[PDB]
Design a protein around this ligand. Sequence first.
Ligand code: FE
Length: 321
Amino acid sequence: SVQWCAVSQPEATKCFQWQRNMRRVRGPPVSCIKRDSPIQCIQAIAENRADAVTLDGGFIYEAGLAPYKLRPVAAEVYGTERQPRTHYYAVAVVKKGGSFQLNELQGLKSCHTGLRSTAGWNVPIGTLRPFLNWTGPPEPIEAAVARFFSASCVPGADKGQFPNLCRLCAGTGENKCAFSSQEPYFSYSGAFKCLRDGAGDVAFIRESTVFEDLSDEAERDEYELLCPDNTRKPVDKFKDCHLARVPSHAVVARSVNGKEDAIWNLLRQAQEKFGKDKSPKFQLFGSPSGQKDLLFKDSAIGFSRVPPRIDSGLYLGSGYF
Ligand SMILES: [Fe+3]
């Protein structure tokens, strides 16, 4: 029986909901362990206290190094059901009717999904590297992006060490700039919320975020995309206007006694019984109102098995930072 690692209290509530719905229809069992961050779950999985967790590209990287050595066993599948993909597009959204392009971003206000995440850090900080005042190590990269943008919200960053990076974060007290749902500018939806609220000028998020979060068509029209050739196209044109195409979030397990057939059998049947438009009792790719992407991404349509003997580095693609 597969033990999933829940990162927050609403993830755990979904996990327990998942567990009782699996027992209800005679699927393979799933138990639940609770932890406070993605790194604690990576550590729990390698310490044999958990067996699975869905991670973002930046954390798939960190799970694949020693002493953890976690490996991707199942990628999340996005796109439509008639046209699926195991990849996403890191984009930079801004309010329409603007002067600026990608190269004139100095001194503006930035909204990020989190420190060391794919579309919100690794990708945009990599694309904007020529524009920075970086002389290389041992100076941390945070300090140079702290002089670039006048204020940001980069969740997970140091409030003491880089105060400018947490300034636009809207969390209260000990949650402001925290890497969790308690900070409301955290993740894809939170970073988009930071642009919507007029706090930042640009949000570095993925391509579907404005289609998810803005159900009303008039308001999606108020935003546009900053393409890397230095032009501005609309939000429906991400396929030609993006910072990078990045590999999808994957479930990671141990590379030694990882139980990956058990993990897959649980995922295939969970997708079959509780996928997009399957059951009205449980949704594996939906979350309750006010919460976003618990356990897996909302509106992902399924899973795809990673072939054997592929580690984190082979998964991430050659051409990573
Ligand atoms: Fe991501």
